[PDB]
Design an enzyme around this catalytic site. Structure first.
Site, PDB file in Angstrom:
ATOM      1  N   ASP A  51       0.854  -1.102  -0.085  1.00 55.68           N
ATOM      2  CA  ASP A  51      -0.049  -0.066  -0.069  1.00 55.68           C
ATOM      3  C   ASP A  51       0.587   0.818   0.183  1.00 55.68           C
ATOM      4  O   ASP A  51       1.776   1.031   0.359  1.00 55.68           O
ATOM      5  CB  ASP A  51      -0.798  -0.222   0.987  1.00 55.68           C
ATOM      6  N   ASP A  52       0.381   2.139  -0.636  1.00 54.68           N
ATOM      7  CA  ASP A  52       1.373   3.872  -0.402  1.00 54.68           C
ATOM      8  C   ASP A  52       1.510   4.095   0.620  1.00 54.68           C
ATOM      9  O   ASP A  52       2.184   5.007   0.740  1.00 54.68           O
ATOM     10  CB  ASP A  52       0.707   4.806  -1.683  1.00 54.68           C
ATOM     11  N   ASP A  67      -2.133   5.389   7.263  1.00 48.68           N
ATOM     12  CA  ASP A  67      -1.468   6.159   8.282  1.00 48.68           C
ATOM     13  C   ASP A  67      -2.279   6.347   9.115  1.00 48.68           C
ATOM     14  O   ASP A  67      -1.992   5.997  10.509  1.00 48.68           O
ATOM     15  CB  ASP A  67      -2.998   7.252   8.039  1.00 48.68           C
TER      16      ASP A  67
END
Lengths: 127, 127, 129, 129
Positions: A67-68, A71
């Site tokens: 995943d980029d 958060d």
């Protein structure tokens, strides 16, 4: 300011991550989380030699789930793929303990803009 | 559309021009026409090995005079430096016969945007 | 590890520096120190609306912006232009105290790779296959 | 000479293709053909507002966008998805007639260098000095 991520830089980060995942023969495949994980996933695949990238979308031994940025979705991934190697390019303080590996550390308060959401356009002079 | 010129592409064009100006030892210096000729001039200088780039601004044997694009200033250059090697990165039909050398041909009607006048910013989705 | 600097990022730094140099109405011109300072000087000139960038291979200085890419000797520049506003994009520790303004702090041992010395070319896969 | 394609330019092509694929309300999804079509597929999904990109290593097709980076065999793709809208970024002559839509025409003998196979690295001066 604002944390700007360009294509070249994302590519460099991905390449660093790729080298950290060697040897390539230990991986069966790569699972990218739509949509942020697509590009980094394609890059890893190209760097490791994995011809096919699988994709998933939230609401596996030998597989890399990418995943980029992390958060907070990490949980859903852990449930679906308990034996997968979850990795991300960027990671904030909160999600840092959730991923198995990441590349760049960014402050919890930083507004990060990804290359796919930007483009090269005319920018008026400051004067 | 609109003829977009990115940094990478400008650099590639400049490098092609540089190789066409070899050997480097035949040149005394490089004169860049403010402001469009500055960047291409610095690139040529770096590629040829010329440590210093001189600058001029319109209203020389062994010297290379460079400008980003020649559409119509070419005349003034010819008067000031009759023996200089006037070169440009881009050239339109009108100015094509004025420069001694150029790299890319662009239609007379094309709106060309240079990298220094642009930047990477957020671009809203088409949807 | 070397500090890679891409054209896009350099431009961001340059624009940020330009913002600090506002308003532009106060500057009489820009003096870019060859050869690395020339590119940022061109960017500044554009952002500030300064139509001409002068170059020097090394007029009291008042009102002029003397720019170079990195700093780490500037003593010569300060001597040549005492009343000029000496600025740079990057700056190392020992060199930090000599400039009037800069943008990015670079560790003293870090090797900076500027955009003009790089190029987009083919890079073999890390796995060789 | 090889046709160099940088990330910036590819994105421009992708966005242009997206414009032709409007409105987005008609598409049920995107099927990116591994491995080159994945990147443009991700860009399309973003521009069109499509939240998920599916991948295939090679459901009738109606409403889906099958995308690949270049075309020059597509016959297999057409066979797997008969009612799908097959599109690409680049396309060579012999391959042109098999796609439903593409963006850039590439000469049959031209070697295209995609962004993902390249990288920004140091390039020695042509003069060696």
């Amino acid at each position: 300011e604002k944390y700007i991520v360009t294509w070249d830089m994302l590519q460099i980060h991905a390449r660093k991550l790729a080298s950290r995942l060697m040897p390539s023969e230990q991986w069966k495949g790569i699972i990218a989380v739509s949509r942020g994980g697509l590009v980094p996933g394609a890059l890893l695949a190209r760097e490791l030699g994995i011809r096919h990238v699988d994709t998933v979308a939230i609401s596996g031994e030998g597989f890399i789930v990418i995943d980029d940025l992390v958060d907070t979705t990490a949980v859903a991934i852990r449930e679906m793929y308990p034996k997968a190697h979850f990795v991300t390019i960027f990671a904030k303080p909160a999600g840092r303990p959730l991923v198995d590996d990441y590349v760049v550390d960014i402050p919890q308060d930083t507004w990060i803009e990804q290359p796919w959401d930007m483009g090269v356009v005319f920018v008026p002079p400051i004067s």
